[PDB]
Every structure is written in C-alpha cells, then in structure tokens.
Design a binder for this molecule. Structure first.
Ligand SMILES: OC[C@H]1O[C@H](O[C@H]2[C@H](O)[C@@H](O)[C@@H](O[C@H]3[C@H](O)[C@@H](O)[C@@H](O[C@H]4[C@H](O)[C@@H](O)[C@@H](O)O[C@@H]4CO)O[C@@H]3CO)O[C@@H]2CO)[C@H](O)[C@@H](O)[C@@H]1O
Ligand SMILES: OC[C@H]1O[C@@](CO)(O[C@H]2O[C@H](CO)[C@@H](O)[C@H](O)[C@H]2O)[C@@H](O)[C@@H]1O
Length: 628
C-alpha cells in the first residue's frame, strides 16, 4: 500500500513551484503532515481491511486526502486551537464538568435564531454540551423527524440558513458549550440528489445504494434481517415505482447507503469534513450498526462496519482532531461496547443503563442494574459512556438475555411484563407510556412517552418527582457524560396531538417530542410546583457533579447494599451513592456499613448521615455520601 510521505508529495503537486515552497513551510502543513504520519497508517489499514485490492481504493484515497488538506487549510484558527487542545487531552469527555442536553430546534426554540436566544438558559442550567436534532433539508411531511436527509449542506429553511447555524455554533462556543449534531451516514432520504441519480441510472452514482431487480436477493436477506419499523414495512427492503427493490432498514423513504462502494465512503467523509469545519465538536454516528451488509448475517455489527468507523475516526485525527464521535448503537450489550474506543467512537450511548433504570422502577429490584454496573460499566481508557434517562426515541429493553438468565430471569417473559407496565396494561402501574412497533411476529415492542409521563406525573403521582430525580441522579453520577432530554428538567408531559397529526399518527415517538412548555418553564423557580421541584433538584445535582472532583472519570465500583431495592456504588473511592427504587422506606443495615466512616456528608440533602447504625432511606431517596 502507498505511504504517508508518498501521498503528501502528490497532495502538493497542485501548487506551482513557487507556491509549493511556501506551503511546505507553513504551520498548517506542518501540523497536517505530522498528523498524516501518525494517523494515516490506521486509515490505510482500516480501509484496506474493507476494500482489499479494489482498483478504486488508491484513487479514492488520494482524492479524499487532497480534500482533507484543503479542508484543514480552510479550517478556522479557533477550531484549530480546539484541535490542539483535545489532541493533548483525550479525556476531556470524561470530566465530571461535562453535562449535556438535547433538543429539537423547532420544538424547543422555534428556529436557529430562537435557539441562540435560549443559550443563556443552557448556561443557567449548567450545560457544556448541546445536541441539536437533524437540522438539514428533508422531505416535507414525513422525514422520520429529519433523519431522512435530502441535503447534508442545505439547512431546513424552516430553521434558518447555514449562516444561522454557523452563528449558533460560535455562540455556543462563546458560552462554553460544545455543539453536537447528527451524522446520518447509513442512509439518505429518497429525495436526496444521490438517490435520484442512482436510481435513474446516472453512471456517476452507480452502486451508491443497494437496488435489486426483484425479491430474489431481498427474500434471502430478510431471512436474517431484524425489523426496526415493522409498522412501516416487512424485512429491510422497499419497492420502487418501476418495480425494483431498494434496501431500507428504516422508513421506505430512507435508502441505505452502499459502503461496499469506496466512493460512498469518500462522499460521506467529505460531508464529515464539511460538518467539522462548521465547528461541530461531536458527531452523533447514527445507526452505526447497519453500515455493512452480508447475505446470511444479520447485517448488524459486522467487522467492516467497525473498520469503516475507525477509518472515519482517522480522517478526523488528520483533518479535524477536535471532532469526536458519539456512537448510536441500540443493540445487544456485548455489541454496544464494541463501537467504543479511542480509535473508533470515543463515547457512545449507554442503552443498557438507561433501559435498566426504567426496569428497576417497575420491578423495584436493582438486580439487573447492579449486574450491569458491576460487569458492563467500566470502559477502555480515553472513552466514555453517554448516560441518559430518555431520548427522542422509544425505550427498547436491550438488556442481555444471557445476563438475565444468570439471575433466573426469562428475557422474553420479562420484556412482556415491562412493556405492559409502561403502557399502563399492568395493575397498579404508575406509567402512562404508549406502545411503539409491536411486532406480532416476534413479540417485541418498545415504549414511547416522556420521563414525566412514565413516572406518573400526568396523574400527579406523589412519587413522580422523586422518581425523576432518582433516575437522573444515577445518569449524573455513575461516570460518563450525562445527557438531559431538555424539557425533562421541568417535568414536560406527552404531546397530546401527535395522534391527530396525519404526518405523525403512525409514529408514537412524537408523543414524547413535545414543544417548549412556556407554563412549566415559568414555574422552574417556584418550589411549590412540580416544575420547580424537578428543576432545582436536577440543577443542584448538576452543580454538585460539576464542582466535586469525586465524580470525575467514568470508573465505578458497585457496593453490595444487601437490600434488593437499593442500588449502591462508589466513585473514586470517595463518593458512596445509594438509590432506593422502592416506593417504601428501605434500610441498609449497620452491619453492611461497618467498613464506612461513622459519619458522612450527603451532598443530596445536605445533612450529615451516621453510618454506624441502620441507614433508612425514604421512598425513592438518593444519597451521595462523601466517604473520602
Ligand atoms: O411495590 C410494587 C409491587 O412490588 C412487588 O411486585 C413486583 C415484583 O417483586 C418484581 O419482581 C416484578 O415482578 C415481575 C417480574 O420482574 C417479571 O419478570 C414478570 O414475571 C413473570 C416471569 O417473567 C415469567 O417467567 C413467569 O414466571 O411469570 C412471572 C409472572 O410474575 O412479571 C412480574 C410481575 O407480575 O414486578 C412486580 C411489580 O412491581 C410486589 O409483589 C407487589 O405486591 C407490589 O405491588
Ligand atoms: O398506540 C397509539 C398509536 O401508536 C401507533 C404509532 O406508533 O402504533 C403503535 O401502537 C400500536 C398498538 O399498540 C402497535 O401495534 C404499533 O406497532 C405501535 O407502533 C399508532 O398506529 C397507534 O394508533
């Protein structure tokens, strides 16, 4: 394979003799050259592992690297400073100081300019990380909430212009907040120019997607394909006007990109560089599990999918060091963690913890949660979990059947219980969620609904507020970067019109995608309201997390509480956390605490607690005891 020095010389051949001389002496080239030598080996290796001796590999690479240089040269000086800072501080993502939030620009603040006006509030809340949902042009009507991209560069006019976005990013950086956007690279909308030209037979866009003449291949593939939206279509394919079939893992209007074609990688790498130069700090790698297909397999988590992502990682290491990745892999735990690594995705959603928080609220038993915190929490160096309570999506019960089997729990039977409980089809359930994608052929089902809707706030369950606080307390202190679903900090309930909207009625996820609730936000300072109680609660926990070094890092050690309703863990051997998932008082005996100091200050309630005697926690109470 060619080497870094070889490719760099060729990159400089576009400059006349006089220019070439100057370029080689410039700071930009110096840094670019150094990073090329350091990271090119990985890029080449990962790409080769996927394409092999593909004739297009070499040509695609030189073209991509030429862009990488141009992209780095044009990169703004301020961004280059962030590039240097993060190069030498790979663990910035692990700082206890980081706290993120996520919202739809349109639902939360109208448009881009409006979002800019909400920045003061984000600072007031303590955010240092902000994820904005899909901002670029997409089909009018149904676009899977913007996840069906028709243009990676043209901002949805309803939100503003590319200029407004560029402005928002700079304002976020000014307020000490990182910009986080989606990198929907597994597929585009069926209205995207690429799709159009590919299907129309433009030789330039040949093999940019997976299109079949009939059901021969589709049927073979469907034998092992999981259905994500069985409500929309069976298997993973959709039929075109002309009768052909296109691979559509998600909605029919979302066509999977064909990474078996190296020119497809180059295309998306180009888009990443575009997003990088806008000043994006973290790219949410959407559906990383499906970017590689292979007949007979599930076409999820394949080796080449990981390799491609590590290739993308390399491009950023060379042309935009500040850009980190956030893996969205809502799959089996064993698979989830494989996307997380310094050379792949530095951080990734922690669906296991999230799903188990809700599970524990239902069963009142921390068994599965404790198991996960004990065996699946700690990660490799320079990587972190993104811990969350809810997201724009439904809740999938992605705990491991094998893990559950160890505890004498039948995964299938357990999920059936969980699903019933959270959609209020179980006696006594406090949850008011809505079903999502009930698959009659598999028994699988997911749950939609806001955090407040699932804890019982819609009916004013007296335990609703403390439940919210408890869940967020755990995502905030286990170790990793905590993500707040904006709207949750004031107990925002479900949207009560989505079912009436013909563009949303067939997607219950819109039930937990409500608009900014002016009334609730106007009560965040009133301790007598649910909004105020939830707000000050979370704000206080955020404040503590960010100021107390004992929460730093992502490592944790579980503590056996000897009480099936109480979870316990220790951060940095100095912070002991207890969490009662019972609606009744529960005790951690003096005998269980013998190894703990006689007294410890609780950062949650502010009181001094004695650990030389039984410790009784009130319903849903959380304690952050300083033991060192
Ligand atoms: O305080 C609330 C209620 O708490 C108590 O009930 C709890 C149980 O203690 C929990 O263990 C849990 O029970 C679930 C169970 O987790 C779930 O797997 C399912 O059990 C199935 C099982 O999967 C299947 O293999 C087969 O064995 O049938 C089982 C049927 O139970 O469903 C259980 C619930 O039925 O959650 C409940 C409810 O929170 C306490 O007993 C209640 O009195 C109390 O109200
Ligand atoms: O349940 C309300 C509403 O949700 C939708 C949209 O997602 O469908 C969900 O609920 C159905 C019944 O529980 C499930 O069969 C389906 O799989 C699930 O997505 C609407 O169709 C329904 O009216």
């Amino acid at each position: 394979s060619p080497n870094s020095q070889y490719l760099k010389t060729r990159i400089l051949d576009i400059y006349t003799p006089e220019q070439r001389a100057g370029i080689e002496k410039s700071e930009d080239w110096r840094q670019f050259s150094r990073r090329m030598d350091t990271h090119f080996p990985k890029l080449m290796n990962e790409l080769d592992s996927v394409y092999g001796n593909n004739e297009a590999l070499l040509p695609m690479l030189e073209m991509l690297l030429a862009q990488a240089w141009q992209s780095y040269s044009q990169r703004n000086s301020s961004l280059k400073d962030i590039d240097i800072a993060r190069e030498n501080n790979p663990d910035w993502i692990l700082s206890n100081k980081q706290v993120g939030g996520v919202c739809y620009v349109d639902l939360f603040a109208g448009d881009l300019k409006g979002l800019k006006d909400k920045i003061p509030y984000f600072q007031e809340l303590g955010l240092t990380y902000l994820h904005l949902m899909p901002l670029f042009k997409c089909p009018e009507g149904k676009s899977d909430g913007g996840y069906a991209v028709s243009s990676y560069r043209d901002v949805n006019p309803a939100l503003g212009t590319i200029g407004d976005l560029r402005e928002v990013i700079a304002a976020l950086h000014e307020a000490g907040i990182s910009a986080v956007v989606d990198f929907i690279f597994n597929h585009t909308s069926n209205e995207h120019e690429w799709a159009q030209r590919c299907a129309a037979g433009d030789p330039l866009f040949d093999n940019f997607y997976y299109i079949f003449p009939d059901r021969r291949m589709p049927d073979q593939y469907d034998r092992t394909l999981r259905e994500i939206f069985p409500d929309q279509h069976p298997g993973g394919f959709s039929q075109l006007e002309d009768g052909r079939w296109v691979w559509t893992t998600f909605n029919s209007f979302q066509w999977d990109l064909n990474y078996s074609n190296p020119w497809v990688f180059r295309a998306m790498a180009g888009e990443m560089l575009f997003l990088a130069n806008l000043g994006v700090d973290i790219l949410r790698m959407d559906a990383v599990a499906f970017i590689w297909k292979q007949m007979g397999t599930s076409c999820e988590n394949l080796p080449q999918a990981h390799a491609l992502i590590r290739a993308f990682n390399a491009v950023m290491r060379i042309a935009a060091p500040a850009v980190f990745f956030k893996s969205e892999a809502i799959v089996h735990p064993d698979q989830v963690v494989q996307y997380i690594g310094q050379d792949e995705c530095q951080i990734g959603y922690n669906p296991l913890q999230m799903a188990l928080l809700w599970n524990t609220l239902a069963t009142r038993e921390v068994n599965l949660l404790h198991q996960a915190l004990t065996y699946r929490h700690n990660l490799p160096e320079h990587t972190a979990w993104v811990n969350y309570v809810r997201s724009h999506d439904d809740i999938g019960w992605t705990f491991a059947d094998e893990d559950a089997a160890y505890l004498g729990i039948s995964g299938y039977d357990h999920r059936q219980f969980l699903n019933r409980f959270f959609v209020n089809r179980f006696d006594g359930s406090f949850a008011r969620g809505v079903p999502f994608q009930y698959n009659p052929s598999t028994g699988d089902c997911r749950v939609s609904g806001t955090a407040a809707a699932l804890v019982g706030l819609a009916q004013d369950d007296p335990h609703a507020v403390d439940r919210i606080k408890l869940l967020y307390s755990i995502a905030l202190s286990t170790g990793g970067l905590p993500l707040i679903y904006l709207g949750d900090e004031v107990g925002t309930l479900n949207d009560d019109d989505w079912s009436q909207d013909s563009n949303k009625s067939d997607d219950s996820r819109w039930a937990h995608r409500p608009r900014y609730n002016e009334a609730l936000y106007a009560q965040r300072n009133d301790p007598s309201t649910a909004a105020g109680q939830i707000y000050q609660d979370l704000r206080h926990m955020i404040a503590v997390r960010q100021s107390n070094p004992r929460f730093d890092g992502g490592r944790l050690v579980t503590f056996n509480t000897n009480n099936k309703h109480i979870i316990g863990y220790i951060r940095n051997n100095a912070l002991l956390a207890f969490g009662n998932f019972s609606e009744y008082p529960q005790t951690v005996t003096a005998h269980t605490l013998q190894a703990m100091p006689f007294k410890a200050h609780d950062l949650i309630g502010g009181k001094t607690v004695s650990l030389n005697q039984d410790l009784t926690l009130q319903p849903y109470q959380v304690m952050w005891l300083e033991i060192a």
